Structure formats: structure tokens, C-alpha cells
């Protein structure tokens, strides 16, 4: 019987390439377009990933759709932060091996306003020295971080699944053997970072929603992202979101 965290580890998505032509000069519009197209492919891989998370496919099909639609940006910002934290201790965003947002790219007009929210995530993972096992538990928890204000169809089963992954995070913390009081502080710190992802995501979504709606910017979004954004905009307008928190 393999451990739950080992089942989350084996389903880690493959690293995707942007297909970014480095011989042509850079621009924020060019990079933003390429990253949106790459983002759609990341989200298609995220559906495959979520379907293999133990318990996820036992939820009502509508709840599966709901959870991926609320959490999409949280998953993407967190997975990006981890990849950026692993490649370097520098201020780099590793979106793809062929498309890294370096210091030169960060100075491109308007590049930083969106990239800073992503930089915060990698900065925090580096500051807290988050482990691979802690990260895997945390990323599954982000998929389960928001629900509709009237709840899910399989709400009882969801609460059971969420509790199981909270317990898995606790087990990952204990493995990094420190005194009982230090493990209490670590759980507090990592769950505080999880809570702060709602604000990181709110900032990313504010800019993302505006960019998608303003057709005069000519910023293309692939079908996968356009569909998620089209679904999510009216949900935020009608207050149809309950952001789950560990602290208050």
C-alpha cells in the first residue's frame, strides 16, 4: 500500500515548453500571448492531474468542474512558484525551460505588475524552505481551497477528502523532525501561506479578467482559459464563492 503523498508525487505533470522563438525580439504582448497559450495546455494537464488525485473522481462531476474552475489560477501560480524556487534562488519566473522571465524581461513595459504576484509565491516557498512532500499536499489543498457559497453537491465527501489532505500536510511536516512546538509553528506558517494564495489569486485575476474583457488590447486566450474566465467572471460578480481559510 503506497503512501498518499507518493500517489500525489507520481501524478506531477510533465514540464511543457512554450515554443518561444528566442531569435525574434521580446515584448510584453508577445510573452503574455505565448504564456496564455501555454497556460491553456497547463490547464488541460491540470484536469488529467486532478482526475488521478485519490478521492477527486468520487465527487459529483459538477463539483469536479467547480473545483477546477475556482482553483485554476491558484494551482498555476503555486506550481509556477515551486518550479521557479527549484531552478534558482534569483528573481526568475520559470514558466517553461524555453521561456524564463529574467531581470531583463522583468523591465519590459507592464511585465512586473502581473509577474510580482508570482514572484511573491516563489519568494515565500524559498523563505519557508518548503519541501517536495509539503508542496504536493499544499497544491492538492489549493484545488480544494474554494467552494460555491451554497456548497458542493458532494459536500460531506469533499470535507472528508479535504480533511485527509490537511492530515497529509501534517504528516509531511512531522517527517522534517523538529520539536512538537516547532511542528505547530510550521503547520501555522504553511497554512498561512495557503490562506494568502486567495489574495495572490485575487490580484492575478483582477488584471487577467480586465485583459480578457478588453478586446482592444488584442490579447489572445486559448479555448481552455477563455472558457474558465467566461464561467468565473459572473460567479465573482454574484458573490458566488466561499474562500476556505485555516486562520482569521
Amino acid at each position: 500500500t503506497p503512501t498518499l503523498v507518493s500517489l500525489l508525487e507520481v501524478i506531477e505533470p510533465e514540464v511543457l515548453y512554450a515554443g518561444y522563438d528566442s531569435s525574434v525580439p521580446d515584448s510584453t504582448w508577445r510573452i503574455m500571448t505565448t504564456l496564455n497559450m501555454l497556460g491553456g495546455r497547463q490547464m488541460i494537464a491540470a484536469v488529467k492531474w486532478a482526475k488521478a488525485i485519490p478521492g477527486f473522481r468520487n465527487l459529483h462531476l459538477d463539483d469536479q468542474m467547480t473545483l477546477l474552475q475556482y482553483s485554476w489560477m491558484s494551482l498555476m501560480a503555486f506550481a509556477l512558484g515551486w518550479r521557479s524556487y527549484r531552478q534558482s534562488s534569483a528573481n526568475l519566473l520559470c514558466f517553461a525551460p524555453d521561456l524564463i522571465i529574467n531581470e531583463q524581461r522583468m523591465t519590459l513595459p507592464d511585465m512586473y505588475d502581473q509577474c510580482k504576484h508570482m514572484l511573491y509565491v516563489s519568494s515565500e516557498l524559498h523563505r519557508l524552505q518548503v519541501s517536495y512532500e509539503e508542496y504536493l499536499c499544499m497544491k492538492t489543498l489549493l484545488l480544494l481551497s474554494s467552494v460555491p457559497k451554497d456548497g458542493l453537491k458532494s459536500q460531506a465527501l469533499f470535507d472528508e477528502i479535504r480533511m485527509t489532505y490537511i492530515k497529509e500536510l501534517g504528516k509531511a511536516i512531522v517527517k522534517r523532525e523538529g520539536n512538537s512546538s516547532q511542528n505547530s509553528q510550521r503547520f501555522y506558517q504553511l497554512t498561512k501561506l495557503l490562506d494568502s494564495m486567495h489574495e495572490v489569486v485575487e490580484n492575478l485575476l483582477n488584471y487577467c479578467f480586465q485583459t480578457f474583457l478588453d478586446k482592444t488590447m488584442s490579447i489572445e486566450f486559448p479555448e481552455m482559459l477563455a472558457e474558465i474566465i467566461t464561467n468565473q467572471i459572473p460567479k465573482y460578480s454574484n458573490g458566488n464563492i466561499k474562500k476556505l481559510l485555516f486562520h482569521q
Binding site: 488541460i44 484536469v47 482526475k51 462531476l61 468542474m65 474552475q69 479555448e223 464561467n231
Partner: peptide, 13 residues
């Protein structure tokens, strides 16, 4: 409504 997402969840991987 959310045609693509529904297709990806319902199809066999």
C-alpha cells in the same frame, strides 16, 4: 456551457 472542461473530465485518459 463549459463544454471543453466537461469533455476532459468525462473522456477516458
Amino acid at each position: 456551457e463549459n463544454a471543453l472542461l466537461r469533455y476532459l473530465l468525462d473522456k477516458d485518459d
